[PDB]
Design a protein around this ligand. Structure first.
Ligand SMILES: [Mg+2]
Ligand SMILES: [Mg+2]
Lengths: 251, 251, 251, 251
C-alpha cells in the first residue's frame, strides 16, 4: 500500500495488456500516471477504466515520434508535477526471420522498439535527474533480449539493443549521481486479448518446451515487478535485467 | 501491506544483516518466520527485536547439518503451520584465491554455501510441494555468482553452483506442477556491522570501479526483493536471477 | 595450415586493425578474401600488403549502403567463386552517453553498426545457404555487447542488438538446414595505430580495473578466433558468443 | 599444423569420447600428452591408439584423488618436461532431480566434477605459473553450466561452480602476471559410444526443441576448440566460456 507515494509515471503503450496492468497497479500504489498510445479512441476509455483524471490521464503519442516526447513530458508535468518514473513499454513485432525481413519492416520496428526507447530514455534522464525524485526508468525487453527466436529477427535486435543500452544509461546516471536508475524487465509469454485472438497461440506458448510452467502469465505478473522497480524499495538496483518468464530462459 | 498474508518462512542466517532485514520485512508483511543461526546466544535476542513469538521465533541450526534440516522444518510447522517459503541465506566466505585455498577451507565453505543450500532446497521441495501454498524458495547468491573475484575462489564456486542448481530445481518443480518456485537473489555489497568492523572495506567497495553508485547498499535493499519473490506477486517468476548491486555487474 | 581450404570470405572494414589481421590470417590459411572500406585510397594498398589479386582484393563499400551489398557479393563471386564466409567487422563509435547522444549521431552509428550488419547477415544467408559451402557468418561485437560503458550509449545499443539478432539468424539457419552458422566475436581492447594516436588510451585500457591482464590485445588475437569460426572445425558452433578480452568481462 | 609446438598437456578422462579426441588432436598439433582414467585396462590401449610413448602416455588417476594429482604432474614432467596445459575433462553424471538426489550421489558427483576440477586447477596454477610456458587451463563445463536440466540437479551445481570458479582463477592469474589462462568449454550433446549404448538418447538430443541443428556433435568438435585454447593463438582469452552446442542455449 502506497508503495509509489508521490511518484509521477509515464507508461508508453499503457492502454492495453501489460502497460494497462502496470498503470492499474501504479495508480493503486499511489502514483499519478500518464498512459500513451498512437491512437486516441482507446486511450480515454482505458484511463477512465483505471481511475479519475487526478490519478491517470491519456496522451496520444507514437513512441517513435521524437518531438512528441517533449510534449508528453510537458503534459504530464502540467497534470501531475515533475515526472519521476518512465516505463518504456510501447513495442511492435514483425513475424519474420532475419532472412525474410524487409528493410521497411526493419526500420519500422526499430523506430518504435529501439529509437522510441532511446528517445524516452535520453529525455527521461535529462528531465528527471538531480531533483531528489528517486527517479526510475524501466525499459521493457522480453525473453527475446536473452535468446533468439528464428521468426523474430528484428524484434531480437531491438530487445538486445535495449538490454545493453539500458546498462550504459544506468552506469552514467550512477557515476554522475543523477538519482536516476535504469533497469530492464523481461516478460515471457503473457495472456492478453491480442493473444486470445490468435488461434493456437497460447497453447503453443504453454508447451513445456517453451514455458516450463505449462501455462503463460498475465499482465499483473509484469505490473508487480514494475511496482518494485519504480518504488524506492529498489534504490540499489540499477543496470540489471528482471525476468518473469515461467522458466522459459532457465532451460 | 499484508503482501505475505498467511506465508510461513524459514530464513537461514536470519539473525544478522541481510537475513535479519528479510525477517523484519517478512513479519511486517504478515509472514510467520523462523530464523536460524549456528549459535544460540544471538538468535533469541534477534527474534524478540523483530516481533513476538507468534510472529517470529529462533531455531539453532548450522545449515551444513543435514539431519538438523528435518528438525528445523518440524519446529517451524509446529509453531506456525506448514512452511511455504524458504530463504537459504546462511553463508560464509574464505578470503583466498583458488591457488591459495586449502582443502579444509574448500570443504568448510562448500559445506555451508553449497551442501547447505542443496539440503534446504531438496527438503523444501519435498515439504512444500502440492499443498496450494504458493511456495517459494529463494537462494542467496551474490554478484560472485556472475563474476569472479580473484580472492574469493571457493566462494565463487559455491555461488555459481547455487545459481545453476536453482534453475534445475525451478524447472523440475514447474514441469511437475509442484507449486514451488525457485529463484536466486544476487546482492552487491551491503553495509552491515560486520563490514563496519573491517577497516577500509566500505570505502574500497564504494569506489566507482567497484560499485558505480559510489556507495554500498543496506540490508533492506535485499529484504524488499525477497518480499516480492516470497509473495504471490511473483507467481510467474521461476528459474531466474534477481540482482541488486548498485551497478557492479553492469560494467 | 590450410585450415580455410577453398573458403571465400568477405571482410567488411578489412583494411585496418582487426579486419586486416583477419584478412591476413584468412589468406595464410587458404581462403580467398575480399576486404572493404568506405574509402578507395587505403584498400588497394592494404590488399597488396597481404597478398596477390588471386588471394585478396579490395572493394569500396560503406556497410550502411544496402544496394552496395549485392554489388559486393557479386564482385567477390566473380573474383573467387561463391562466397562461403562473411565477417561483418565494419563499425564506428560515438563517444557520448545516452543522455548526450544527438539523434544524428544515433542514426549514423546504427546505420553502420546495426543496419549494416543486418544487411550483410540477411544477404549472406540468402547467398550462402544450401550450397554445401560450410558457410559461416561472423558478426563483430565487442565487450560492449555484454556490459555497458557510460560513454558509449549508441555503441552499446548496436552491440547488444547484433549479439541477439545473430542468435535469431543462427537458429533459423540451423532449423532450416541451411548450412550457415552465425556467431559473434567480442574483442576487449586491442592495440592498433588508431589507439596509438589517442594519448593515454592504451594506458587507461590497460589498468587492472579495466583489463586484468594489465595490457591490451593485438589484431591477431581476433584473427585467430575468426579462423576457427570460419573453418569447418567449428561446424557445431552456432548462436554463440566468443570473447577475447584479457579478462575484462570476467570481473 | 604444429599449433601446440612444445606444449605438454594433461587431459583427465582422456581415454574416451571428448577427452580422447582432445588427446588425438593435441598430439597431431605437436603437444605431448598424458591422459588419465580411474581405470588401467582402457588407458594403455587408448594411448597407443593415438601415438607412441614419446607423444602420449597413460596415468591411472581418479580426479577426485587429491594426492594422486601431485603424482600425475610428477609423472608427466618426468616423461615430457614441465606441464604447460591442463584439460580438466573427467566428469560423471547422476540422472536425478535435486529433489531426488541422495546425499551419497551428491557427494560422489561433486568429488569428481567439482573437487577434482579444483584440485587440478589449484595444482596447475602452482606448477605452471611464472615459467614462460604460455600455460592454459581448460575446464570442461557443458551447456548445463548455463541452463538447468530438471533431471541433472547435482550436475548443474557442479557445472555452474566450475564456470565461475574458473573466472576467479583466471582473474588471479592475470592480475599476478602468472602466464596462466583459465577458460571453460561448454559442449552441447556429443555422439560417443556411450550415447550409442543408450536407446533413444541421440534421437531425443537431436529434436529441434533441444538441438536446433537437428543432430548432435562429435568429439572432434570439442577437440578443435580445445586446441585453440591450449595454443598461444588464444593468449588474450581468459575468464571466458566457449560454447559448442548446435544452438542449444541460443533458444
Ligand atoms: Mg564487470
Ligand atoms: Mg533455452
Amino acid at each position: 500500500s502506497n508503495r509509489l507515494d508521490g511518484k509521477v509515471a509515464i507508461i508508453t503503450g499503457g492502454t492495453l495488456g501489460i502497460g494497462l496492468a502496470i498503470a492499474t497497479k501504479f495508480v493503486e500504489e499511489g502514483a499519478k500516471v500518464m498512459i500513451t498510445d498512437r491512437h486516441s479512441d482507446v486511450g480515454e476509455k482505458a484511463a477512465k477504466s483505471v481511475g479519475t483524471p487526478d490519478q491517470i490521464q491519456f496522451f496520444q503519442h507514437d513512441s517513435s515520434d521524437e518531438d512528441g516526447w517533449t510534449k508528453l513530458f510537458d503534459a504530464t508535468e502540467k497534470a501531475f508535477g515533475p515526472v519521476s518514473t518512465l516505463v518504456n513499454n510501447a513495442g511492435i513485432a514483425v513475424n519474420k526471420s532475419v532472412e525474410e525481413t524487409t528493410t521497411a519492416e526493419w526500420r519500422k520496428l526499430l523506430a518504435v522498439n529501439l529509437d522510441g526507447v532511446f528517445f524516452g530514455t535520453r529525455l527521461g534522464i535529462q528531465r528527471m535527474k538531480n531533483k531528489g525524485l528517486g527517479a526510475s526508468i524501466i525499459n521493457m525487453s522480453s525473453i527475446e533480449g536473452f535468446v533468439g527466436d528464428p521468426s523474430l529477427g528484428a524484434y531480437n535486435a531491438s530487445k538486445g539493443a535495449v538490454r545493453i543500452m539500458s546498462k550504459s544509461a544506468a552506469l552514467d546516471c550512477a557515476l554522475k549521481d543523477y538519482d536516476v536508475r535504469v533497469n530492464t524487465v523481461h516478460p515471457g509469454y503473457i495472456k492478453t486479448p491480442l493473444v486470445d485472438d490468435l488461434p493456437g497461440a497460447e497453447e503453443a506458448m504453454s508447451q513445456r518446451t517453451k514455458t516450463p510452467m505449462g501455462h503463460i502469465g498475465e499482465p499483473n505478473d509484469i505490473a508487480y515487478i514494475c511496482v518494485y522497480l519504480a518504488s524506492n524499495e529498489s534504490k540499489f538496483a540499477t543496470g540489471s535485467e528482471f525476468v518473469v518468464d515461467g522458466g522459459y530462459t532457465a532451460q
